[PDB]
Amino acid sequence: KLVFFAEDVGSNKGAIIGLMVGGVV
Amino acid sequence: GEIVYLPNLNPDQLCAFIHSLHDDPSQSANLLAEAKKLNDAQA
Amino acid sequence: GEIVYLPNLNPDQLCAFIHSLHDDPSQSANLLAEAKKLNDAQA
């Protein structure tokens, strides 16, 4: 399974788009 | 910072979501709330 | 779970990736390899 999530990093970047790959972290 | 996962979200919603994150960095945080709510709303 | 980050990919690219990723789940690993390539290509 794959999952799309956004990480709050502040800055002029706002949040970062990161995705999970397989199972659960 | 805070993290928001979009599992039950719709792919088109993800595209619109990523678009909104880029439109304004400050909004990303607020968008994260609504986006996260969608995961619950579409759950 | 292996977690990937694509801050370097533009919304259009992430949208393209997310659509292809969703449309072809079987190729999700291979397609990701390309996004990882993009991660480096957009680096």
Domain total in chain C:
1
Dihedral over alpha carbons C18, B16, B39, B8 (to 10 degrees): -30
The rounded distance, in Å, linking the Cα atoms of B43 and B15 is: 18
> Do B21 and A6 make contact, defined as CB atoms within 8 angstroms?
yes
Secondary structure class of A20 (helix, strand, coil): strand
Q: Do A7 and B7 touch (CB under 8 A)?
A: no
> b vs e for C23-35, b when ≥16 Cβ sit within 10 Å of the residue's Cβ?
eeeeebeebbeeb
Residues of B in contact with C19 (CB under 8 A): 11, 15
Query: What's C26's DSSP letter?
Result: T
CATH class as words, domain A1-25? few secondary structures
- Domain holding B34, by residue range, is 1-43
Six token digits for residue B17: 């979501």
How far, in Å, CA of C33 to CA of C39, rounded?
9
Residue C8: closest CA among chain B residues belongs to which residue? B22
Residue extents of the structural domains in chain A? 1-25
Are B21 and A17 inside 8 Å of each other by CB?
yes
- Cross-strand pairs, A4: A19, B6
C15 interaction partners in chain B (CB closer than 8 Å): 14-15, 18-19
Three-state SS string across B1-43, please?
Answer: CCEEEECCCCHHHHHHHHHHHHHCHHHHHHHHHHHHHHHHHCC
Q: What angle do CA B43, C31, B1 make, to 5 degrees?
A: 50
Rg of the Cα atoms in chain C:
10
Determined by: NMR
